[PDB]
Amino acid sequence: CKMFIGGLSWQTTQEGLREYFGQFGEVKECLVMRDPLTKRSRGFGFVTFMDQAGVDKVLAQSRHELDSKTIDPKVAF
């Protein structure tokens, strides 16, 4: 069970993402994929971080938004 970010900017990265949530949510590992081969995702970043207000401070960025891209931090389900 880990968190998952949706809407990876057109230049987002992994550690940069570990640093995007690790700021208030200790990140243990994350996965970034791109290049949509089929009707599946089209660029996202998983992050199995974990902290007291983790999912909290994370919702504050429910839109993320950075390089003109409002990602969508969504943890668990």
| Assigned token pair, 59 | 């919702």
Distance CA 74, CA 10 (A): 19
SS3 state of residue 65: coil
What residues have CB less than 8 Å from 30, skipping those under 6 apart?
14, 17, 18, 45, 46, 47, 48, 49
- 1-77 maps to which CATH number? 3.30.70.330
- H or E, element range at 19: helix 15-21
Experimental method: NMR
Distance CA 75, CA 10 (A): 21
